[PDB]
């Protein structure tokens, strides 16, 4: 019969009461099911195993080996997610990490020089740092292509920036850090307060209290 929604949010989506990802993001609600994000962007988003790695706990019998793994969800319009997962099997790790990406999912965008049409780069330079690694995403003029490491480029393309500049620092072999600090950089793009998000608009209705009677009776 397909997935049965559990929790308040899945319930709205199965119902179809709320349409689009933005409504969820604006209200800052926890996405606790992957069956949500499969539904809303249910077309373009693609799984991409970034890498696998072996990992070794010592024990009294020698070396219980487990496989750590990354995947990365990427709609080409301005969304991204990233998840990591260990398991004993390789398939359980990958099919785990696919789900963890969806649980965590909007990348802000803007123009380099003049406002032209349809934005293609980070609004302002931003750096996300995980552990040793430092990632810097820099404003960049049109038709430059993206430049980074091929680890970072795959994730960036999913984000959808047409052209970008980059400046890595620290111990960039450690790829689980390097990809995360890229993901964390794109998280910081909405944090940075510009002149454009001045004014106050009216606060939108939070979609539980709006639909608080279809939910019950």
């Amino acid at each position: 019969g397909g997935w049965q929604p559990r929790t308040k949010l899945g319930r709205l989506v199965k119902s179809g009461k709320i349409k689009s990802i933005e409504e969820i993001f604006y209200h800052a609600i926890p996405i606790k099911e992957a069956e949500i994000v499969e539904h809303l962007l249910g077309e373009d988003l693609k799984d991409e195993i970034m890498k696998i790695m072996p990992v070794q706990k010592q024990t009294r019998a020698g070396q219980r080996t487990r496989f750590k793994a990354i995947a990365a969800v990427g709609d080409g319009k301005g969304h991204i997610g990233l998840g990591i997962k260990t398991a004993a099997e390789v398939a359980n790790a990958i099919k785990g990490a696919t789900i963890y990406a969806k649980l965590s999912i909007p990348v802000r965008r803007g123009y380099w020089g003049n406002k032209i049409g349809l934005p293609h780069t980070v609004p302002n330079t931003v750096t996300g740092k995980c552990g040793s690694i430092r990632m810097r995403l820099i404003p960049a003029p049109r038709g430059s292509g993206i430049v980074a490491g091929t680890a970072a480029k795959k994730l960036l393309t999913m984000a959808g920036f047409e052209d970008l500049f980059t400046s890595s620092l620290g111990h960039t072999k450690t790829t689980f850090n390097f990809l995360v600090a890229t993901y964390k950089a794109m998280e910081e793009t909405f944090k940075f307060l510009t002149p454009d998000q001045w004014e106050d608009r009216a606060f939108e209705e939070h979609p539980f209290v709006k639909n608080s009677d279809w939910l019950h009776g």
Binding site: E22, P30, G78, G110, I116, F190, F192, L193, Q197, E204
Partner: protein, 87 residues
Amino acid sequence: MQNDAGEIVDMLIPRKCMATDRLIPPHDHASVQIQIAKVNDDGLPTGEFETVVFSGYVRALGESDYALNRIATEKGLLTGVYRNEAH
């Protein structure tokens, strides 16, 4: 943010905290959106609410209490409470 020939671009606008005035991102799940019932004189509800917002920064410190005093008395939902007295 604006395309400049015309139009408006970008999807979604983060709501802004009333205390601090910073942006509320997607993932700060400590963010809060209140409803407070405005009432007719003699305490009759009018079916019309004020929606007060806070970011997860302001709650984390302690101070989101004291903002609710300041913001409500500005809108006209309390008397006393804000401004004096200790001793």
